[PDB]
Amino acid sequence: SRVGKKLLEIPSDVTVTLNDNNTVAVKGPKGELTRTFHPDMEIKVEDNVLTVARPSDQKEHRALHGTTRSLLGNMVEGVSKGFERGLELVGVGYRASKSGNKLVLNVGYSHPVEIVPEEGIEIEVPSQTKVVVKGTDKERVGAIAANIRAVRSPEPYKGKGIRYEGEVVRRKEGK
Amino acid sequence: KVRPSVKPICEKCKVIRRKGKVMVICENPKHKQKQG
């Protein structure tokens, strides 16, 4: 009836550590993740499946069990498959550009837009409009997508600026 | 809009309690209400 009871099958080939004071390092083919946890939870790992168990029925533990199991699922999904957040630059003069590892956006400002990616996160620009960010952590690619959207928010009258996949902006009528 | 009478205007409105403050979020941005 809750997410802390369903099994989480991991693919081949990954492995997980069970270090003291609840520090979890996850190894895999596409990177490395390490997070610090809370000492109140006891974590146990079985054969090719991960389980998180609650200590009590309190509301803090009921939240924390679900958050821990969800972020472990995010780790095992990102270490083997990864996560992509696709963005589209809609407009007659909009362009994402590449100069080495630097990402350049030809947004209609009077100054060229440059954003510095962090380590382990890559951005590829295949075409006129569509751009793909690549990473192994959902938090980092979400922060990168938010930072890309922050330089130009989409305005409601016409489709301009940074836009995700399918999501409706509120259409307004001008004069 | 900031008012001490935060209420769901339409059926799509959802009442939430971010940061100890009663709030209403909705698909329509005109229905966004906060108190405190």
Add this chain to the structure above:
Amino acid sequence: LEKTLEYSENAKEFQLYGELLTANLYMLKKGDKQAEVINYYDEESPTITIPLNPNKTPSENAQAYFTKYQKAKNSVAVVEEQIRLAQEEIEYFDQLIQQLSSAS
């Protein structure tokens, strides 16, 4: 009011033009005006028409024509009522002119 009674017959032609535009509004939507229209009614096959529309929407121009037609038929009701009231008022005022003209 009789001018609006002639505008009643004028509005019907506009409604017909809007219907013709609707049965043909699937192409040249962007900036649509003076587009030749093939006769949808009668065996007359009358000369292709060339409707001119403002830059709202290709459907909202025909829809605006159809709204003007609804207002026109409500006008057919109300202006005939107003003409009846106006002749009643003119008869009463001509009578009042008569009674004031011969009065002490």
Add this chain to the structure above:
Amino acid sequence: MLLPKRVKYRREHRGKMRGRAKGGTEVHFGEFGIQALEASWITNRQIEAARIAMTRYMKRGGKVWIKIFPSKPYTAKPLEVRMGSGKGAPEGWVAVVKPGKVLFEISGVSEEVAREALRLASHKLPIKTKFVKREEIG
């Protein structure tokens, strides 16, 4: 606008509002009503506002029974004068309402129509309100 057209005395003591309602505690004319929880004077202007607020939303339905009447006058001395030198002139009329008293009575409509009409009436009143209905033991 409710007021007596004749009174025995035009100036009266303000009285006290201790205890529960002496009468008019149970709903016995309409199906639903407002039961008072606190005691204060209710001005006939507030009664008129609540009555219009119920009657407008019940444009089709039964009539409203007004269980309270503003029989007690209150005097208001004119402004910017010294204290004393005689009691002032009467200004308006209020009804002494105690907790537990039924204020307005509605029958002949649906449940939610009556609840919303009583809520719109209660938002005009200066007292805490609650929704009550007839009980049939009986």
Add this chain to the structure above:
Amino acid sequence: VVKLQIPAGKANPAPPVGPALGQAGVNIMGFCKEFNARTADQAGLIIPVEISVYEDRSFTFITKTPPAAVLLKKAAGIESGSGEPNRNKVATVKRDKVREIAETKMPDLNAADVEAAMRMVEGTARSMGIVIE
């Protein structure tokens, strides 16, 4: 595919068959004669015709049965229905032509038995305002 109910006796001009076949990319006037050829023996009634679409601009039309509403107008005689059905009982249709109307709808309706079909067209007759008697 775009399906539509085409009247038999007014299929020549630019109404209904015009803009439906225009957006498909075919000449309407070259197929109006083909429509009027197969709608000759059911003329005066509005017949739904399926309009299949192909990539090579060749079009073959699969005609359907007349609707139960139009067939009840044929069985009764009145053209336009009442303002409020089951409030102004304008007509009464006997059960034998009801059975005939139900039997006409064999090749398109997926009913296993004719009794199910006559129970369906009893329900369609109630929407007509027509007494099933």
Add this chain to the structure above:
RNA sequence: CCCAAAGUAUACGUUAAGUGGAAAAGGAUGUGGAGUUGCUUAGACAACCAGGAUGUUGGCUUAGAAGCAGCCACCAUUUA
């Protein structure tokens, strides 16, 4: 508890705001309790894979109301 004399006393709960240590109408999926009621391992509320229909564009209605302007008895099948 210390200033400041004497319990960082015992048992059972409650509050998470510095309420305690400043007021109301009104608003609110805060939380601890008490009591009904529909369902529930014949498998419950949500989530993910599929059906989401032909009589039928049900009628009146505006060109057009094709379930989704309005008024409307609001039915019948294939059936999981």
